[PDB]
Design a binder for this molecule. Structure first.
Ligand SMILES: CN1CCN(c2ccc(C(=O)Nc3cc(-c4ccncc4)c[nH]c3=O)cc2)CC1
Length: 255
């Protein structure tokens, strides 16, 4: 219940949405009582690699504004040696909170949300970005439309959406994002994530890598949706469907 100034404009704090490590997200109001969301980043103890992660994200978020309206709007930012203030658009709820709350999920709504996600992820891919950590939390609902809020660039954690090739990478391509998007859609379809059954985290990782671990796809009145899920959840990235291929899929094109 204080106020902040961003590029000579005063914003009164309505409420705090999020709290990260060195960051805070607020629902704020301008002089004309218009709502915005302000991301505040305290830089006081951030390292060179951390500052560069924050600078890269702001540059990408600022460039990608113009390429899609499925990417969160960034009106303005203030960047000093001490802080970051990002003036952005306000959404009603994130997809994770929305999915946890929603008992039933309408096929028309699911399909529209899938399309929204494919467009956002496709845009970041066209600019050489692979998010690599997609989960419902990265999507905000803003006037019935899902928007991507994060690019995976800046640095509870859920191993439930991790691609099999990301686990193998110990001794990551656009296909990695296809696996994660497929998990979100599997959740929106069957009410759960593919490897949510495995309560233990150690064995959950073995399951994603195990080719003989059959993922269940119970029959749906939407057979097109069933193929999307079977194509996204292919353990071999080489055999996994691509985003340009998903945009031409009958599930997205045929109503
Ligand atoms: C019961 N429900 C009520 C609704 N509720 C939420 C949860 C999250 C957000 C949110 O993150 N909002 C925003 C987040 C961001 C953002 C955050 C991080 N990086 C970039 C942009 C930008 N604009 C926003 O409006 C807004 C509302 C959860 C509990």
């Amino acid at each position: 219940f204080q106020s902040m100034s961003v590029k000579g404009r005063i914003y009164s704090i309505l409420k705090q949405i999020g709290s990260g490590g060195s960051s805070k997200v607020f629902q704020v109001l301008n002089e004309k009582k218009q709502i915005y969301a302000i991301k505040y980043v305290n830089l006081e103890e951030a390292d060179n690699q951390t500052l560069d992660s924050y600078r890269n994200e702001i540059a990408y978020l600022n460039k990608l504004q113009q390429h899609s309206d499925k990417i969160i709007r960034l009106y303005d930012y203030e960047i000093t040696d001490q802080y970051i203030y990002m003036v952005m658009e306000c959404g009603n709820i994130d997809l994770n909170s929305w999915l946890k709350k929603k008992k039933s999920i309408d096929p028309w709504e699911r399909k529209s949300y899938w399309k929204n996600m494919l467009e956002a992820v496709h845009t970041i891919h066209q600019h050489g970005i692979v998010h690599s950590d997609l989960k419902p939390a990265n999507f905000l609902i803003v006037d019935g439309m899902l928007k991507l809020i994060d690019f995976g660039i800046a640095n509870v954690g859920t191993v439930n959406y991790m691609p099999p090739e990301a686990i193998k990478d110990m001794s990551i391509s656009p296909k990695s994002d296809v696996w994660s998007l497929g998990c979100i859609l599997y959740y929106m379809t069957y009410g759960k994530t593919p490897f949510q059954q495995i309560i233990n985290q150690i064995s959950k990782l073995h399951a994603i890598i195990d080719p003989n671990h059959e993922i269940e796809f119970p029959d749906i009145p939407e057979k097109d949706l069933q193929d999307v899920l079977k194509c996204c959840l292919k353990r071999d990235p080489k055999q996994r469907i691509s985003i340009p291929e998903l945009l031409a899929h009958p599930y997205v094109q045929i109503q």
